[PDB]
């Protein structure tokens, strides 16, 4: 079958991968940028074009929507939906999953255990935003939009205040988060794909730092899961409506706390620590739905 | 019953006559900034607070969420929401109807007649966007994530080419659209409460301009519309989910053309040039859904 | 004499005393909106014009230009230097004098003592960089470009340490400076008119707060400054090359320390708790000078 | 002796082959990114530290700045400056030579021969600014701060009204020239350093566009330059106090016409379509000049 690839760029690991696991099962595959897309959208279910040419239909479709051109491109990724192909996560399920606030609080309503966090932007009394999530040391990470740019800990009741009424009124909302000291710099990324974890990996932040993401500078070994942590991060990615999903879990003493989740998550770190064929079992999923 | 407004400025014209209708109606109101707003999402439902306070229960509440502050905004009024207030429209309809691209697609599905619009980020044959849309002359309206800031006309074909291959890759997305030039620069606002358009006026744009806008220099007069007008912006603001909205209408030969659906539009000129109690009317319709 | 005020608003207290102190003294006044100039660079000399008509020459011309609109407003400033007008604040001085951090070395170099202060972007070791300006407690200023739009205290080690790599990449570069505790959140704003101080405050800070500035809710009284602090007043407003200089000082134990140096200073509020005529004296100063 | 290389990547062409070209001549060389320095600037001439540790004094300096880090940029060089080293292009020529409006006034001033270009930001009579540049063909670039993000050519005077109105208001400034018809797309880059044009290419802009820039996807050429060229290259540099330039130059019936100065321009096309040993040049003037 025909699919595309939407994505800015197309030789990085994980489109690559896509393109290769797809051609090797059988199927035509094209790697579009969407910022390259131009469509009519009225009258409804216009052809898209593609550098001076019609697209052909596509029978399903595999969003790799940069976090920075969100807006357009799930525009052109629903265009795509109207159109009749299949949705490898669902342009509304993939806005909804970029908004970290409005997720972390369909999470907490679905009661999926996160770690006590709360937000604010120009608040006005910090000692009583401090006393709310716990008190310190406590995480404050800070986000433009949806975009966070920020992570940052804080051990003090002072170092607390000061970071967030530096951040205070700065145009940026920010979430306080209480540290999970126990993790000692941890996390555990689990992939989904459809009904089931098909991957996770454990990572490890470098010495002198709780930042356990890899470019940060961190550790990739193999995780082994409990049942339960597989149950939820299955749960979780459900509640986003994602068909792929990136779950991110902190390990803490009264157990697995979600903490983020990404809807287009890279592949290459978790792939080459795991040895597992995710992309190929996400072209399956697309299979076993497409048509 | 205590009802918020949720307003960075409670001053301007809309949030004050809101506030004394509803007083005025044996009401309870506060007028909160949402900025100032912090609160715990994790757990679910725990309370708001607000300059070092929690809040009191609202048994209802008005977005009036600033299109800058769009995601911390309805992050607050989905916290009121998940606490138990009614909002004079939902959180998820207010960021669907932000995204201006989402809400045409969404529109032109549902058979409402638009003006024919295509959309385009980095284009790169601009001679095939342009022949896709009907050729000149064309409005080219460009917009950065959510936010327009520029409206265009092009009256040739070169015109045209040139400020679409100037915003070309500027990194903002851009729509060309039918430019209705039979409206000479005149638009029907209507404001939809619930199931009924409650007022409408006509905008005359200033002569040697087309842009409509009351700023932009433009008359206002009180505006009769068709019933088949009224039908098709109830059927609008339903299709977006707004228990109040703003819908945008040009006159054009084929018939009545939606081209833009606000989802808190500005009452001042539209009550002080037709003398309807707008603000009561939204009032009314809380109560009769408010519990 | 016909001179201009470029300021893009004319109605704030600052532009319309000078446009009443300059018409009251004799003279001709248009207030022109810097961004409605347009001009000819090439070929030199060629005249201003203003919303489709040309300017007349003007004798003067006093800048009071948006911190934001900087470049375009310098540029404008200086082809009417081209020209022939006297600028009260060349535009390279105002340019300049936009830079704090060109400025503050500028100082320093000429043995001006200002309060010990170090800059860092995107530093590496936080520690090393707080051991460098003395340890704690310590002032943090971030700014954008030259736009700084946070100010901060860090009383602990770990506060300022979490406040640096907060700001850390953050794409902003920062100044952490000596917390002159002895100020107890007081400083003397001085104005500079050629060679004299002609007015001085003094703002005190609201209680709990550090921040001497009006706006984030200070007192201003009647400053009685050292013959000490007038002579490094003007010196300071000399070293930078300003005509008009609003020269912000700190009392410190060893002495009066410069900390900011405005080249367009607002002057209600100086005006209106000293009395003086501040703009008639930078209007004689032209006068003055002028021709 | 002792040289460093400012810039915030070091494996790119030309800062390779100026360490390259340094070693090889007998010197030790270190590539420093701006952002990871950090200084004391008060007291004057403070040692620099990078990375825990204190800087040796550099006899010299190459400033590579980032267009978008020039503030802190050249900041850091200007301590370098202030502490002993020896600058190849001095900060103030730099900051002078970013603003491309300064600039080309400043080159128009001293008589150098450029193409009509005006300038304006909100203006308020499109009709009026196109009638001043000489009416259409033009082309219109623009410039967010010191920033340009679009070049576009307007051949009808609908296209340039369509564009400067489309701009206008759009909050960065802009210029219109007169379009160079008779360059058939070509531009002429001289490299001065010092008193001399060292190299030269010639950019010819692919079919169907008049952009010479070689990354829009442009040929180079070895470019003959006449003597007059040759000079006013030279005297173009000198008006703005660089030591190492690139001039550009079109080629226009009247006469060679400067268009733009960089002050850091790249070497690898120029050095590797001419065989000029360039990085060798400078590094010969910084022997010549450096102590
Ligand atoms: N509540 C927390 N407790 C401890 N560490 C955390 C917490 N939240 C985030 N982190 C650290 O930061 C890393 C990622 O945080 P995250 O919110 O994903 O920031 P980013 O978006 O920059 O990746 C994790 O590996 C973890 O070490
Ligand atoms: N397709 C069109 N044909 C004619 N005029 C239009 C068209 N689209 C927009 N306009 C003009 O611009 C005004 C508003 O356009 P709009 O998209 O709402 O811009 P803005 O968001 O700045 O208000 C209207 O009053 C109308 O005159
Ligand atoms: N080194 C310092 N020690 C104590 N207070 C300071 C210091 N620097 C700034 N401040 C406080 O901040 C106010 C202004 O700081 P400033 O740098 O001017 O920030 P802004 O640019 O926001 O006005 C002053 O009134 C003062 O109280
Ligand atoms: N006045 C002009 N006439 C013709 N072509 C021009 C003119 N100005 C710029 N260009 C074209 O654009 C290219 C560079 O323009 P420039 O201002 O340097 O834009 P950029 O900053 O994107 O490089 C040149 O090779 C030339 O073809
Ligand atoms: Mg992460
Ligand atoms: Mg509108
Ligand atoms: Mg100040
Ligand atoms: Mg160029």
Same mark, same amino acid.
């Given at each position: 079958?025909?699919?595309?690839?939407?994505?800015?760029?197309?030789?990085?690991?994980?489109?690559?991968?896509?393109?290769?696991?797809?051609?090797?099962?059988?199927?035509?595959?094209?790697?579009?940028?969407?910022?390259?897309?131009?469509? $009519?959208?009225?009258?409804?279910?216009?052809?898209?074009?593609?550098?001076?040419?019609?697209?052909?239909?596509?029978?399903?479709?595999?969003?790799?929507?940069?976090?920075?051109?969100?807006?357009?491109?799930? *525009?052109?990724?629903?265009?795509?939906?109207?159109?009749?192909?299949?949705?490898? $996560?669902?342009?509304? *399920?993939?806005?909804? *999953?970029?908004?970290?606030?409005?997720?972390?609080?369909?999470?907490?309503?679905?009661?999926?255990?996160? !770690?006590?966090?709360?937000?604010?932007?120009?608040?006005?009394?910090?000692?009583?935003?401090?006393?709310?999530?716990?008190?310190? !040391?406590?995480?404050?990470?800070?986000?433009?939009?949806?975009?966070?740019?920020?992570?940052?800990? *804080?051990?003090?009741?002072?170092?607390?205040?000061?970071?967030?009424?530096?951040?205070?009124?700065? $145009?940026?909302?920010?979430?306080?988060?209480?540290?999970?000291?126990?993790?000692?710099?941890?996390?555990?990324?689990?992939?989904?794909?459809?009904?089931?974890?098909?991957?996770?990996?454990?990572?490890?932040?470098?010495?002198?730092?709780?930042?356990? $993401?890899?470019?940060?500078?961190?550790?990739?070994?193999?995780?082994?899961?409990?049942?339960?942590?597989?149950?939820?991060?299955?749960?979780?990615?459900?509640?986003?409506?994602?068909?792929?999903?990136?779950?991110?879990?902190?390990?803490?003493?009264?157990?697995?706390?979600?903490?983020?989740?990404?809807?287009? !998550?890279?592949?290459?770190?978790?792939?080459?620590?795991?040895?597992?064929?995710?992309?190929?079992?996400?072209?399956?999923?697309?299979?076993?739905?497409?048509?």
């Amino acid at each position: 079958m025909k699919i595309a690839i939407l994505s800015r760029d197309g030789t990085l690991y994980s489109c690559k991968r896509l393109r290769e696991a797809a051609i090797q099962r059988g199927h035509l595959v094209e790697i579009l940028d969407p910022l390259s897309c131009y469509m $009519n959208i009225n009258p409804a279910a216009s052809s898209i074009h593609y550098k001076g040419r019609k697209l052909p239909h596509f029978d399903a479709v595999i969003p790799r929507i940069g976090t920075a051109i969100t807006f357009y491109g799930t *525009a052109a990724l629903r265009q795509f939906e109207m159109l009749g192909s299949y949705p490898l $996560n669902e342009s509304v *399920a993939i806005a909804r *999953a970029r908004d970290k606030l409005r997720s972390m609080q369909l999470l907490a309503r679905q009661g999926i255990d996160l !770690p006590v966090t709360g937000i604010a932007h120009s608040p006005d009394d910090t000692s009583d935003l401090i006393d709310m999530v716990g008190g310190a !040391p406590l995480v404050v990470k800070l986000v433009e939009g949806t975009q966070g740019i920020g992570v940052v800990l *804080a051990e003090t009741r002072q170092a607390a205040e000061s970071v967030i009424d530096a951040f205070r009124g700065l $145009n940026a909302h920010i979430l306080v988060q209480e540290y999970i000291k126990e993790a000692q710099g941890c996390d555990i990324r689990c992939l989904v794909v459809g009904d089931e974890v098909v991957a996770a990996i454990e990572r490890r932040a470098k010495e002198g730092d709780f930042r356990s $993401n890899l470019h940060r500078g961190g550790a990739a070994s193999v995780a082994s899961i409990t049942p339960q942590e597989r149950e939820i991060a299955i749960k979780a990615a459900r509640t986003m409506a994602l068909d792929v999903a990136g779950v991110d879990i902190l390990r803490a003493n009264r157990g697995p706390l979600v903490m983020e989740v990404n809807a287009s !998550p890279g592949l290459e770190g978790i792939e080459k620590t795991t040895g597992i064929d995710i992309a190929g079992k996400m072209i399956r999923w697309i299979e076993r739905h497409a048509t």
